[model samples]
Target chain A: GIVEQCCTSICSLYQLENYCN
Target chain B: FVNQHLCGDHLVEALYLVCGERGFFYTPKT
Candidate 1:
């Protein structure tokens, strides 16, 4: 069987805002 | 390889919740 291609993005929670400040 | 640098777990991880999951929901966009 073959898996087709798909993609998207999600953010990390409480992981740290390093430059987010 | 620059291949997995993109088509890799990093983007695969992106498919889930960024507060899009339970508990952390809308608490912050972070």
Candidate 2:
């Protein structure tokens, strides 16, 4: 399920990137 | 044990998360 991981990672990234602001 | 077929949904969700509403255009069956 690499794709699933990729998706989770991407959303996590967006969350983290915007979480700081 | 994971279903690899569900990766399609994962990809779709990922596209939306990354591209917003416009990501729908990337759908294969569209």
Candidate 3:
């Protein structure tokens, strides 16, 4: 599950730039 | 189909996903 969690976290950040703007 | 899965591809993709943006910031208190 760790790898999945990490992947989700990293994927979640994919949209961070949009939120930050 | 196991250890090689972690090293041969996923790691590079993960690193690329993170380090590809070397000019970004993670800050707060805006």
Candidate 4:
């Protein structure tokens, strides 16, 4: 069923360093 | 996601905290 196929996902990102260096 | 980083509504929770550089060292350090 289409109702059963519905799902949710989350993505996250963070900074490791900056370019000013 | 680009503009969301500049605001409060999209805040990410800090689950843990660590202090001191030695904590990251694995068994040995110079």
Candidate with maximal DockQ: 3
Which of 1 and 4 is ahead in TM-score? 1
Q: What is the lDDT of residue A15 in candidate 4?
A: 22
Pick by lDDT: which candidate is best? Answer: 2
For residues A1-21, write the lDDT of model 1, one tens digit per residue.
Answer: 001222122223223121112
Candidates 1 onward: DockQ, in order: 0.07, 0.08, 0.14, 0.04
Chain B superposition TM-score per model: 0.25, 0.46, 0.38, 0.14
lDDT of 4 by residue, B1-30 (tens): 331122222221210111122232211113
Model 4 spans with C-alpha error above 4 angstroms: A1-12, A16-21, B1-4, B13-30
Clash counts per candidate, in order, are: 0, 0, 0, 0
lDDT of each: 0.25, 0.38, 0.35, 0.18
lDDT ranking, best first: 2, 3, 1, 4
TM-score of 1: 0.21
Tens-digit lDDT track for model 3 on B1-30? 122223224544444455446633323223
Q: DockQ for the candidate 4 complex?
A: 0.04
List fnat per candidate, in order: 0.03, 0.03, 0.00, 0.00
lDDT of 1 at A14: 28
TM-score of each: 0.21, 0.35, 0.28, 0.14
Candidate 4 versus the native: TM-score?
A: 0.14
lDDT of 2 by residue, B1-30 (tens): 122232456555544554553323433443
The parts of candidate 2 lying over 4 Å away from their true place are A1-21, B1-6, B21-23
